[PDB]
Structures are given as C-alpha cells and as structure tokens.
Amino acid sequence: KSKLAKPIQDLIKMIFDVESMKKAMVEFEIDLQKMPLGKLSKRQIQSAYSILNEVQQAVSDGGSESQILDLSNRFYTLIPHDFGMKKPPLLSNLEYIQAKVQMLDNLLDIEVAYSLLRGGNEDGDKDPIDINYEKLRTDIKVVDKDSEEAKIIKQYVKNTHAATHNAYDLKVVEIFRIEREGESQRYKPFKQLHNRQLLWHGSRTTNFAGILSQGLRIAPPEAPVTGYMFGKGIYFADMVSKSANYCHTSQADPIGLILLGEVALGNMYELKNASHITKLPKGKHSVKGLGKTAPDPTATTTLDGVEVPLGNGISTGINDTCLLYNEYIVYDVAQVNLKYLLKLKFNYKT
C-alpha cells in the first residue's frame, strides 16, 4: 500500500485520471476514434504548431484561399476532428487559429501525462500511486491548515476574488508545498532580482502531470507568436479570480488545481494593450499588462521575502487599458520557482 498521505494519494489519482484526459480531448473536438490517447506524439504536435503558424501567416498577409484550404486539410488530417453533423470550419479566422494553438498547448501536457502513466509500472513492491508519484520527481507535502503559511494563502484566495467573476465562490480544499527536482537550483540566479512576487497560475487538471514533471514552460519554437497576447512567455495573475478561470471547471466538475509560484519580475515593461513581444527592452525582466482592478497595494505582505499581493480588489487609476486585471509574463523558464499547489472547490451559484 501507499506510504503517501491521503490528500496526496487523491491528488495523484486525479492528475493521472485517464477519463479526464479523454474528456479534455473531446472538448477540443478531437476525434477519439481516429485519434486515441495512445496516438499522440510530440513530433505530431510540433508539426501541427508549424501548420498553424503558416496558416496564421497566410491569413494575415492575404495568402491564396487555396493555400489556407490546403493548410486546413493538412491540419485536420494530422489531428482528426469530429464536428458531428456540421461542416468542418476552415482555419481562416484568426480567433479560431488561436483556439487551436491553445488546444495544442494542452495536448503537449496530456501527451506527457499519458507517456508517464504507461511508463515504468512493473514494480510489484510499490503501490501504483507511489510509483506514479515518483514519476513526478516533485516532493509534495501537505500544508497544515492552521499554520501561518495556510492562513496567508487563504487570505490571498478570499481577498483577490474579483467582482465580475462572482458567478462562483471558491473554497480551498487542500494546500500542498511542492518542490520540483532541480528547480530551486535553476532559479537561484534570480534571487538577485528585486520585485519577486507570489503569483497565481491556473490550468486544467489534465496538465498537471506535465506541469510537475517538466515545470511551467514557454511555447515551442514552432508556435505562432500570435497565439499569445504578450508573446511566448509564462503567464501569471495577482487575482485568484483571473487564474481560476483557466482551470476550466464547471457545475458538473467543480474541483480545480491552481499554482502559486514565486516569480522574479524585476523591472516590469508595463503595457495597456496586447503586443506580440519577441525581444524584451534592455533593462526589463518581465511584462505587466495593466488592469482596471488589482489588489490593494496597502495590504501587501511578505512570505519568506516574497511579496504577496493579498489586498482587496481596488480599482487602479488607469482607465485607458484593455485589461480588466493584471497579467504578468516572464520569458525565461528559470524566472519562476513553483511553491504551492491548491486543490480548489468551485461553488457555483444556482
């Protein structure tokens, strides 16, 4: 049997749940009959990104419609889709292309989860749960619900829940202290930077085996820079609300996972509108999309020397901005050090 605490056991079962992987793929409209979980390969996903990159270029620059049709056909042949009784939409709309780039970001993590799940499981002297946990190469520990650490985090969750996102409440079911192998080490150089903050990162439960084993990562070289509002970086938020939405939970599936990572922001390059950033200006370490609301700078605390913006959602003096809430982007995978993983229960208003 498992040596791990129950909460952790329940966490492992959840992140390695095969049915959840299929549900995700079905939602992205993949054809599970022609494209089963076992057919997914990294090479396959890379090719798909390139195709999306080319089609994106042809739509922007006014390429032949014959070009766009051929690119669509190759994309749907590479990744079989099931549109039911409707005709398959062409990759000729920039919004639809962005949706498809998002889908591939997810398939990248699902592919990792499945590969690990089918990996070295022969050992009979270990419980299945224990074997998969070790595959994550991440030391996971339960944070004592009553300790100061937990109190601060519960405060961060409660206070930063936005007004417009109050279509659901949020209950912190469990808090885990996570420490990925080799991460503290690659992050070391950035402790020299100032403006290090504890920020939020939401994602589907299906991406977590990938997130824990490989860490958060920037999109590959093949992905169009256009598929992302501020370019190919790693995104974070200061309002639990903003990130929580990326968990993709529902009335039918209410438990989501969310990360709290220490992020070395340094001098932020502040923006009010989208910009497909490739190069970061000299002297800037990150990007900050400004929002109309943000935690009250008054209430900002520290936790082990890292700033925690746990203040209440106060409106900022900026009005000429497209964003409702702040977004922080780092363009170097070493600029983040994951700290906690929270098991959240989304309570929907009905």
Ligand X SMILES: COc1cccc(C(N)=O)c1
Q: Supply the minimum distance, in Å, between the C-beta of residue 203 and ligand X.
A: 6
Q: Is 56 in the site for ligand X (CB under 6 A)?
A: no
Question: What is the rounded radius of gyration, in angstroms, for the C-alpha atoms of the chain?
Answer: 21
Please say which residue, 53 or 326, places its beta carbon nearer to ligand X.
Answer: 326
Q: Is 236 in the site for ligand X (CB under 6 A)?
A: yes
Window of 55-63, 162-170, 199-207, 316-324 that interacts with ligand X by CB under 6 A: 199-207
201 is in an annotated binding site: yes
Q: Is 266 in the site for ligand X (CB under 6 A)?
A: no
List of long-range contacts for 280-286, beta carbons under 8 Å, 24+ apart: 280/331, 285/193, 285/195, 285/330, 285/335, 286/233, 286/328, 286/329, 286/330, 286/331, 286/335
Q: Supply the minimum distance, in Å, between the C-beta of residue 108 and ligand X.
A: 14
> Residue 125's CB: how many other CB atoms inside 10 A?
6
Q: Is 59 in the site for ligand X (CB under 6 A)?
A: no
Window of 154-162, 176-184, 233-241, 316-324 that interacts with ligand X by CB under 6 A: 233-241
Angle between helices 94-117 and 18-27 (to 10 degrees): 170
Binding-site member from 196, 201, 232, 343 for ligand X (CB under 6 A):
201
Q: Is 237 in the site for ligand X (CB under 6 A)?
A: yes
Q: Is residue 149 annotated as part of the catalytic site, yes or no?
A: no
Restricted to residues 136-155, the positions that interact with ligand X (CB under 6 A) are none
Please say which residue, 133 or 176, places its beta carbon nearer to ligand X.
Answer: 176
Q: Is 202 in the site for ligand X (CB under 6 A)?
A: yes
Instruction: Give yes or no for a contact between 311 and 326, defined as CB atoms under 8 angstroms apart.
Output: no
Instruction: Give yes or no for a contact between 218 and 336, defined as CB atoms under 8 angstroms apart.
Output: no
Please say which residue, 105 or 174, places its beta carbon nearer to ligand X.
Answer: 105
C-alpha distances in Å from residue 21, one per residue of 77, 138, 190, 252: 21, 21, 35, 16
DSSP string, 79-147: S-B--TTSPPPPTTSHHHHHHHHHHHHHHHHHHHHHHHHTSS---SSS-HHHHHHHHTTEEEEEPPTTS
Please say which residue, 117 or 287, places its beta carbon nearer to ligand X.
Answer: 287
Binding-site member from 17, 246, 248, 292 for ligand X (CB under 6 A):
246
Q: Which residues pair with 337 in a beta bridge?
A: 262
By C-alpha distance, which of 182, 223, 174 is closest to 51?
Answer: 223
Please say which residue, 129 or 310, places its beta carbon nearer to ligand X.
Answer: 310
> Breaks in the chain, named by the residue before each, with C–N above 2.5 Å?
none
Q: Supply the minimum distance, in Å, between the C-beta of residue 235 and ligand X.
A: 4
Please say which residue, 196 or 242, places its beta carbon nearer to ligand X.
Answer: 242
Q: Supply the minimum distance, in Å, between the C-beta of residue 67 and ligand X.
A: 29
C-alpha distances in Å from residue 266, one per residue of 23, 47, 200, 281, 288: 39, 35, 17, 13, 11
Binding-site member from 97, 266, 327, 335 for ligand X (CB under 6 A):
327
Annotated binding-site positions for NAD(+): 201-203, 210, 217, 243
Contact residues: ligand X, CB under 6 A? 200-203, 235-237, 242-243, 246, 327
Catalytic residue set: 327
Annotated binding-site positions: 201-203, 210, 217, 243
